[PDB]
Amino acid sequence: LPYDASKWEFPRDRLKLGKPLGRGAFGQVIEADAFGIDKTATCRTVAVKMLTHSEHRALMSELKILIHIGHHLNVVNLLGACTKPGGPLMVIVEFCKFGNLSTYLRSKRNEFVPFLTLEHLICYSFQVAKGMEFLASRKCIHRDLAARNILLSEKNVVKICDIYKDPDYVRKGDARLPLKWMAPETIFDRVYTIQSDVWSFGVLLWEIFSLGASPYPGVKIDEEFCRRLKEGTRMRAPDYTTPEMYQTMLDCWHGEPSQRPTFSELVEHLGNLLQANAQQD
Ligand SMILES: COc1ccc(-c2oc3ncnc(N)c3c2-c2ccc(NC(=O)Nc3cc(C(F)(F)F)ccc3F)cc2)cc1
Numbered sequence: 001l002p003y004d005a006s007k008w009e010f011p012r013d014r015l016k017l018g019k020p021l022g023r024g025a026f027g028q029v030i031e032a033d034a035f036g037i038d039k040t041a042t043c044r045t046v047a048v049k050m051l052t053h054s055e056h057r058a059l060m061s062e063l064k065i066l067i068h069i070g071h072h073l074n075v076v077n078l079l080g081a082c083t084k085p086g087g088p089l090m091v092i093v094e095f096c097k098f099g100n101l102s103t104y105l106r107s108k109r110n111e112f113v114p115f116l117t118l119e120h121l122i123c124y125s126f127q128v129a130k131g132m133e134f135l136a137s138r139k140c141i142h143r144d145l146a147a148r149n150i151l152l153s154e155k156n157v158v159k160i161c162d163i164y165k166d167p168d169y170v171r172k173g174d175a176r177l178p179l180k181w182m183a184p185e186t187i188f189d190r191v192y193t194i195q196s197d198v199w200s201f202g203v204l205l206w207e208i209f210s211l212g213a214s215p216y217p218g219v220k221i222d223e224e225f226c227r228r229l230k231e232g233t234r235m236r237a238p239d240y241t242t243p244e245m246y247q248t249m250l251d252c253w254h255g256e257p258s259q260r261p262t263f264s265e266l267v268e269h270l271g272n273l274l275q276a277n278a279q280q281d
Contacts, residue, residue, distance in 0.1 A: 001064045003083065008067065010037060010080030012087045021047060025164050026055055031095065037079050045097075046079055050090045063091045069138050074131030076151065076161040096151035096159055103173060104152050106212035118242065121208050122277055124150075124158050125245070126270040128204060131160040133263035136194045143192050145200035146181050147207040180215040184230045185257060195257035201266070202252025209245055210238035230255070244273055 018031035027049050034046045051059060066078040082090040098104055101124065108116050128150055135142060142149075142162060151159050165174065183199035185191040203215050216235060219225060234253050237246040248269065254260040261269070 001068065003064070003067075003081075005083070008078070008081050009084065010034070010082055010092060012082045012090070015046075015048065015082070015090070015092070018045070023164075027051065027059055032092075034079070034092065037092065045095045046092050047095045048090050048092050050088045056089060059089055059091060065140075066091070066093070069135065069140060072131060072134040073157060074127045074159055075134060076159045094153070094159070096153040096161075098152035098154075100148045101150040101152055101158060102147035102176075102207060102212045104212070105147070105208065106173065109211045112211060112240065116211075118240075119274075119277055120156065121240065122245070122270065122274045123156065124208055125205055126267070126274050127158045128160065128201065129263055129266040129270050131158075132197060132201060133267050135160070136197075136263050141192050141194055142197050142200070144178055144181065145197050145204055146176065146178070147204050147212065148176055150204070176214065177221060179221050183257070184226070184255060187226055188230065193257065194263070195260050198252050198257075198260040198263065198266070201263075202249045205245060205249050205252065206235055206238050209241040211240055213238065242273075248273075 014035045014037075016033040016035075018033060021029040021031055023029075028051075029047055029049045032046050032048045033043050035041075035043050037044055037046060049059065049062070060083075063078070063081050063083075069075060069078075071077050076096070077094050078091070079094060080092040082088070082092070105116075128145075132142070132145070142160070144162070145160075149161050151161055153159055163175075179187065181200045181203045183191075183196035186196045186199075206215060207213065216225070232255060234250060237249075241249075248261075248266070251261055252266075
């Protein structure tokens with residue numbers, strides 16, 4: 001796709017290198033301080049993804065996809081890039097200072113009461129639905145929608161984002177089993193659609209209302225698990241759910257993709273639950 005450098009290109013000399021945020025198999029991310037990236041005279045912390053032709057192509061692909069998606073409050077947003085010859089290829093996105101939502105909710109289990117409250121949990125759910133409705137409108141499918149892939153920014157705003165680590169330092173929580181988020185049709189027939197994202201969203205809801213527990217507690221994820229899933233077996237309600245939120249999970253887990261709610265429908269419904277939650281008398 002084309003690249004409008006006027007719109008996106010940011011000077012490398014206006015990025016002050018900061019702390020490493022992670023290296024994966026392909027691409028390392030660092031914090032940086034960017035002067036003037038939003039055209040005002042401010043220094044802003046940002047996250048920078050930086051680097052074979054295959055690797056170059058993949059990072060350039062991410063840049064182009066982000067430009068295509070465009071801007072929404074609840075999707076990690078592209079701020080700029082450094083592509084011109086003479087320095088590394090860099091993709092600059094919004095920094096989310098509080099990390100992923102799964103780990104965060106886990107850390108708050110002794111700081112929750114109906115502190116986190118149902119208002120927070122329903123709000124996070126609503127925001128993710130809003131981000132997914134947006135992505136669906138751009139004809140995108142996420143394919144691994146899970147609380148680990150939702151980052152937490154200031155003022156409780158959550159943002160959707162999209163095997164390598166030294167085993168000496170691996171801790172419980174550092175990995176998850178993506179199979180546990182996959183729709184039956186994605187498991188059995190590698191079918192990914194916006195409606196399989198809705199199934200995943202149901203799992204993400206369960207994560208939120210379990211305050212960051214792993215799905216299908218104690219269940220072995222094998223051919224038997226998969227069989228029971230197709231037949232209709234579902235997770236039980238998590239410990240901090242409301243009845244309405246568990247009903248929504250069940251709806252998202254409809255066995256027929258076309259009978260699951262759409263993200264627009266989930267936005268309307270969750271917005272209603274959220275509004276009802278904070279009403280008077
Ligand atoms: C080892 O690999 C990694 C290490 C650290 C991080 C990271 O850490 C962070 N800490 C704080 N804020 C951030 N934005 C990040 C980020 C960070 C870096 C990049 C991105 N990029 C995207 O989300 N891209 C993206 C997003 C989508 C979307 F989900 F929005 F649809 C689709 C395709 C995409 F390529 C999002 C978050 C990402 C990968």
